[PDB]
């Protein structure tokens, strides 16, 4: 039984991607200081405890599920699509999410506000004519006052309905103050939608929509994610744990319940 570790995660044979200052979700959405991870791949994503967010304050209803799905997909390969947002201003940004000197936003998201004095009922559609699954990431803005709601989206109450033939999600935005995060009581909530082959994404909204810019290519492989602070090293080791890479020669182990690769069983 293996009860000791080297203290270091070996960079072979598996492709290890060090997240450094970024969680996988921040990389997915396109937090400016995670832009280097655009279009990256991994057999194992390593989330460090030093990770932080530095964009618009946000949460994810059902965080752990989305995180797991993306981690298992093992890629952030984005494909921009031509979404036609008729009658609304695009590319909304913030000082809470700087990219370079100027104000910016999540790179994979498109913050739609009013155009002139009107916010029309948006209704776009986007079929999946490919043979693989598309992952769309979108959200809803929750203003902290009514003043903000009517300044940004005109209508006193917003609504976001993203749907496919199988499933549907309608969100009504909650107008009210949250705890102050980097000078902002307002929030964005993130939702996701999978669109299978032959199926059609339909987004419809009269306010508060944080629109998607395209999709992410989904795969099913050996990819996964792990929380660890152990540094990376130029060695070979089949088994990886959070406490470090371990020899798998012995039939069992009790270094950690969480493992990746061809490993001994936990006791």
């Amino acid at each position: 039984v293996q009860s000791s570790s080297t203290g270091k995660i070996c960079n072979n044979p598996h492709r290890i991607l060090d997240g450094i200052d970024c969680t996988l979700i921040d990389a997915l959405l396109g937090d400016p200081h995670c832009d280097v991870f655009q279009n990256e791949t991994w057999d194992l994503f390593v989330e460090r405890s030093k990770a932080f967010s530095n964009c618009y304050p946000y949460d994810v209803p059902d965080y752990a599920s989305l995180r797991s799905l993306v981690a298992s997909s093992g890629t952030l390969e984005f494909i921009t699509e031509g979404f036609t947002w008729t009658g609304v201003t695009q590319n909304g940004g913030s000082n809470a999410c700087k990219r370079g000197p100027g104000s910016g936003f999540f790179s994979r998201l498109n913050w739609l506000t009013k155009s002139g004095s009107t916010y029309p009922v948006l209704n776009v559609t986007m079929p999946n004519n490919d043979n693989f699954d598309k992952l769309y990431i979108w959200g809803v803005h929750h203003p902290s006052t009514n003043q903000e709601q009517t300044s940004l989206y005109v209508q006193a109450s917003g609504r976001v309905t993203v749907s496919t033939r199988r499933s549907q999600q309608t969100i009504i935005p909650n107008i009210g103050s949250r705890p102050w995060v980097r000078g902002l009581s307002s929030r964005i909530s993130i939702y996701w939608t999978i669109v299978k082959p032959g199926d059609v994404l339909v987004i419809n909204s009269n306010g508060n929509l944080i629109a998607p810019r395209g999709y992410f290519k989904m795969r099913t492989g050996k990819s996964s994610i792990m929380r660890s602070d152990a540094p990376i090293d130029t060695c070979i080791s089949e088994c990886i744990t959070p406490n470090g890479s371990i020899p798998n020669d012995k039939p069992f182990q009790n270094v950690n319940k969480i493992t990746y690769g061809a490993c001994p069983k936990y006791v």
Epitope: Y56, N91, G93, S103, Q147
Partner: antibody, heavy 137, light 108 residues
Framework: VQLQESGGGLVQPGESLRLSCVGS?????????????VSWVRQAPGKGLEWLSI????????DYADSVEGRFTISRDNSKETLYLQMTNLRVEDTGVYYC??????????????????????????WGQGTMVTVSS | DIQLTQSPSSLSASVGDRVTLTCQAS??????LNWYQQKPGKGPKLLIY???NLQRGVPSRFSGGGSGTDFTLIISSLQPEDVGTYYC?????????FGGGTKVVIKR
């Protein structure tokens, strides 16, 4: 929104003079002047309108005309709903009435933390009454 | 820098006449163009924004048209109050400029 200017007066050629412009009230929603981009515009006696300087809602994306570049500095204090035009090294031909003029398209919502990435700088939908600046000896 | 040339420089028409002011442009400015009514001893007020759009509050008798380089501001029925100078203004590119002016006078 309504606007009003102040700070105008008599000055000697070469002197400095600050002009202020206070915004008051509410437009669509309850949006104050701090939601908008504003520019300074002057009119010499018996002449046309000359655009001077623009500033985006949040204080960035500033540009000038060649006639006043290097000498004039545009700036704003949104906590006070006020715009400023500092003028230095003034000359006789800078004489005229100075207007504050708001661009209509909303550029920010401060309480929300939104900013439009493109500076539209479109139609001057609100003007002040104007303030008289005179440069002489 | 984009120059705007208005025509005429000065005009006279009777109460209820159809009046045509024009603004011509140094280059293609698409429809990034506005019009303004400066009354005498008072500040400018927006009439037309973005080539053709009438401002809320401004009488229906005023209208706007054009694109590219040529643009028109029509008064369908000139009134006593409609005296004063009219300016066209562009914002296609910096620096922003105004027209020379068109002074309108009532003929009685």
């Amino acid at each position: 929104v309504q606007l009003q200017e102040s700070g105008g007066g008599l000055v000697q050629p070469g002197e400095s003079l600050r002009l202020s412009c206070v915004g008051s009230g509410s437009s669509f929603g309850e949006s104050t002047l701090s939601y908008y981009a504003v520019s300074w515009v002057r009119q010499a006696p018996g002449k046309g309108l000359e655009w001077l300087s623009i500033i985006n809602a949040g204080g960035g994306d500033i540009d000038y005309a060649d006639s006043v570049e290097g000498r004039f500095t545009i700036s704003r204090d949104n906590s006070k709903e006020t715009l400023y035009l500092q003028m230095t090294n003034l000359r006789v031909e800078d004489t005229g009435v100075y207007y504050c003029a708001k661009h209509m398209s909303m550029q920010q919502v401060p309480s929300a933390g939104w900013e439009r990435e493109d500076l539209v700088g479109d139609a001057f939908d609100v003007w002040g009454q104007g303030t008289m600046v005179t440069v002489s000896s | 820098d984009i120059q705007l040339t208005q025509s005429p420089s000065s005009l006279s028409a009777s109460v209820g006449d159809r009046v045509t002011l024009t603004c011509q442009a140094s280059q293609d400015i698409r429809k990034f163009l506005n019009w303004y009514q400066q009354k005498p001893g008072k500040g400018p007020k927006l009439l037309i924004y973005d080539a053709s759009n009438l401002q809320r509050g401004v009488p229906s008798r005023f209208s706007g048209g054009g694109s590219g380089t040529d643009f028109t501001l029509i008064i369908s029925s000139l009134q006593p109050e409609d005296v004063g100078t009219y300016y066209c203004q562009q914002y296609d590119g910096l620096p922003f400029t105004f027209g020379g002016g068109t002074k309108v006078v009532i003929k009685r």
